[PDB]
């Protein structure tokens, strides 16, 4: 596997109508990682995002908590989703960067966000980050920041696509 990466990891390989699929956004060895802005695309005819309580996402809904970016260094969380098109766009980053650097234990590896999806149809369907004109410096729909607030411009693999029911592929 690549030394440094971001990947959308699914808890399931296959799913029937009515099941929940959990997508974990996992980073690995991102030097001095302090936050991200991610543009994720799914097929809204096949999957429906819901919160941990089961509530359908709205425009401002953030993904669920993972295993990192859960510390109180004044986390900034902003979402701007398009549920009609199947786009989740969210920013999640520590603001208290002086305190974060001082702690000297950067969260370089872990799950930054979790998205739970209701499976609406049993068919092959993918989830991937994708570029968007609203976020021009994205690398395959991903922007990762270090703990100086600087964009990490290279060196990590965007591992894609995540696919449910690949065994049913039409192509
Ligand atoms: N999968
Ligand atoms: N959520
Ligand atoms: N954490
Ligand atoms: N955390
Ligand atoms: N803080
Ligand atoms: N804080
Ligand atoms: N992880
Ligand atoms: N990871």
Automatic annotation (TrEMBL):
Residue ranges of the TM segments: none
Domain of life according to the entry: Bacteria
Compartment(s): Secreted
Protein's UniProt name: Cellulosomal scaffoldin adaptor protein B
Species per Swiss-Prot/TrEMBL record: Acetivibrio cellulolyticus
Taxonomic placement: Bacteria, Bacillati, Bacillota, Clostridia, Eubacteriales
Gene for this chain: scaB
